[PDB]
Amino acid sequence: HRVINHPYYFPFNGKQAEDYLRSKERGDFVIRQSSRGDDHLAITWKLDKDLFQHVDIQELEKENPLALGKVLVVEGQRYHDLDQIIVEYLQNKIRLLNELTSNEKFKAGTKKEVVKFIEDYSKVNPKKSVYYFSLNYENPGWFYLIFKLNAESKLYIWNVKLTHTGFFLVNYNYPTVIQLCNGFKTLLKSSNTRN
């Protein structure tokens, strides 16, 4: 619970940890109490100037939840302390963010820009199809996956969750953006074997 002493810790509310990071960088993180137990904590991490996601933690290996767990569990994986879950979860998450953002499949940086880039890329190519990944603003910690058959077509979107273990979509995690592209291909083939 709120007994953390780490330099990334803040007793701030979820809105306060947000508005704190909204004054920080395109990559930010602060530890704060969880809304679902004393054996639980959270990390609020920032993706863009006004975009953030909460990631709960469980303080495992303690006889009482009033006591600080000898381990910290994140997305179902244990670690020795908050500084381990932060370096592991953040640095792995941030490198996956560099490989996705550097990907040719990744669109622009903010809603307006990506909607302008997908529509512009669709209308300048009104007979070619369009499919790109970008930040999701209604569902942080997930990236949106916009698809159009062409300029004259409707628009469809799906999502991929970001995790320090990779990218998670439909039902499985891919430890790198390249494997996410393989996941998408093996999944569309499993979908084409139905359509």
């Binding site: 996601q53 909460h54 499919y131 209604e138 569902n139 942080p140 910690g141 997930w142 996956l145 698809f147 058959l149 469809y156 799906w158 999502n159 991929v160 969750k161 979509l169 439909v170 998408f184 291909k185 999944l187 569309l188 083939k189 979908s191 084409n192 359509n195």
Partner: peptide, 16 residues
């Protein structure tokens, strides 16, 4: 929002 998974498949709409 922030706690609401949703994602349909790639939808290849073709023999891909």
């Amino acid at each position: 929002p922030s706690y609401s998974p949703t994602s349909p498949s790639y939808s290849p709409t073709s023999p891909s």
